[PDB]
């Protein structure tokens, strides 16, 4: 009856309403690749704009939730904004009541808990976005925590998201198999961008441009994004590798 139309349990014990949320985040066809450097965390994501009449600069999916913590969104942009707004509010609040800015771990856990509550309520629809939170914390180092629409999250050595993310997994797996460590041993953050772009080309078979890329880098104690001019320096630097 309503075991697939609201968030109540079925005879299977599996919530069909929740499953549908994960079947809408891959329909925007945005891939992400996120790697932990030795001093940084770099995340690159697709930014396919097929129109002359959309301004590509304002088409974005990397939202700065703290000054140190970036968030990259795979899935629909209404739900992205709502989850960004809520996350920013909480991160500010944490500074206010605990006297230091919210960790990546706990910010992930907080959105995770709200996602469960949104699938507890039968009239509230969960936010159907996969959120990757990249940072460099001083108590956790370079970190990636990835929350999902259900309310599950875990840490990561590296992670990918999108429909074609299995291909990305193959590259990352080889990289950390050979190195025998959970991060990239590269001490320049710029070259971790260069590496990330290389494996994106390998995985998807797609040759990238500066207007198909959007790059976020968390270094120690600051988060910035590269502009398309800076991303072009990296694309020229692939030829110099």
């Amino acid at each position: 009856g309503y075991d697939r139309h609201i968030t109540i349990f079925s005879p299977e014990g599996r919530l069909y309403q929740v499953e549908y949320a994960f079947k809408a985040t891959n329909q925007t066809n945005i891939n992400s690749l996120a790697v932990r450097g030795k001093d940084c965390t770099v995340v690159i994501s697709q930014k396919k704009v097929p129109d002359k009449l959309l301004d590509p600069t304002t088409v974005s999916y990397i939202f700065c939730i703290s000054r140190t913590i970036g968030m990259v969104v795979n899935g629909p942009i209404p739900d992205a904004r709502n989850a960004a707004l809520r996350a920013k509010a909480e991160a500010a609040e944490f500074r206010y009541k605990y006297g230091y800015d919210m960790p990546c771990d706990v910010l992930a856990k907080r959105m995770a808990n709200l996602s469960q509550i949104y699938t507890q309520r039968a009239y509230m629809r969960p936010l159907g976005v996969i959120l990757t939170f990249v940072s460099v914390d001083e108590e956790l180092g370079p970190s990636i925590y990835k929350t999902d629409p259900a309310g599950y999250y875990v840490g990561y050595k590296a992670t990918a998201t999108g429909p074609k993310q299995q291909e990305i997994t193959t590259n990352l797996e080889n990289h950390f198999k050979k190195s025998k460590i959970d991060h990239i041993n590269e001490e320049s953050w710029e070259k971790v961008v260069e590496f990330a772009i290389t494996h994106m080309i390998d995985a998807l078979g797609t040759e990238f441009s500066k207007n198909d890329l959007e790059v976020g880098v968390a270094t120690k104690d600051k988060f910035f994004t590269l502009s398309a001019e800076n991303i072009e320096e990296r694309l020229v630097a692939i030829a110099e590798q």
């Binding site: 000054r67 707004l85 509010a89 991160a91 500074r95 206010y96």
Partner: peptide, 12 residues
Amino acid sequence: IVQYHLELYTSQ
């Protein structure tokens, strides 16, 4: 309080 609302201001 005022710091609290300019964290939220700078981020949006």
